[PDB]
Design a protein around this ligand. Structure first.
Ligand SMILES: Cc1cn([C@H]2C[C@H](OP(=O)(O)O)[C@@H](COP(=O)(O)O)O2)c(=O)[nH]c1=O
Ligand SMILES: [Ca+2]
Length: 129
């Protein structure tokens, strides 16, 4: 897979951010994760976590997988990196997202994330507390 440049337009929520990619504004949905809704336990904390990561980053990158690059809502599907740290993975590792929406072809980093979730669960972090 390849990291590509993007700039933060606006942090949205635990699952999504508005990013400028190839000079066009786009909502990006993070591959392989599901964060709680704002009304759900740890929903606000998940959005807060990603907001800080993306806002504080000097460099945002997007990494498409081998399959669909846009979902049925027109959202980009990618791994999102903030100063080379993957936000997707970071969420799961902190117990603020579950691994989810694993479709064949778009699952390059599935095992990495599952390992993170196992650790979060063992440490009883957040949604696993
Ligand atoms: C994460 C992801 C979601 N989606 C679709 C499935 C879901 O359809 P439905 O809206 O019909 O439930 C929705 C979940 O995204 P959200 O968790 O952001 O709602 O986005 C994909 O098609 N591919 C993906 O990789
Ligand atoms: Ca969600």
């Amino acid at each position: 897979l390849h990291k590509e440049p993007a700039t933060l337009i606006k942090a949205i929520d635990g699952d999504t951010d508005k990013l400028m990619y190839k000079g066009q504004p786009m909502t990006f949905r993070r591959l392989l994760v599901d964060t709680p809704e704002f009304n759900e336990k740890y929903g606000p904390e998940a959005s807060a976590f990603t907001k800080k990561m993306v806002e504080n980053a000097k460099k945002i990158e997007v990494e498409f997988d081998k399959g669909q690059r846009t979902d049925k809502y027109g959202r980009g599907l990618a791994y999102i990196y903030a100063d080379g740290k993957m936000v997707n993975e970071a969420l799961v590792r902190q117990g603020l997202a579950k691994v989810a929406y694993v479709y064949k072809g778009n699952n390059t980093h599935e095992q990495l994330l599952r390992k993170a979730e196992a650790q979060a669960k063992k440490e009883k972090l957040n949604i696993w507390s």
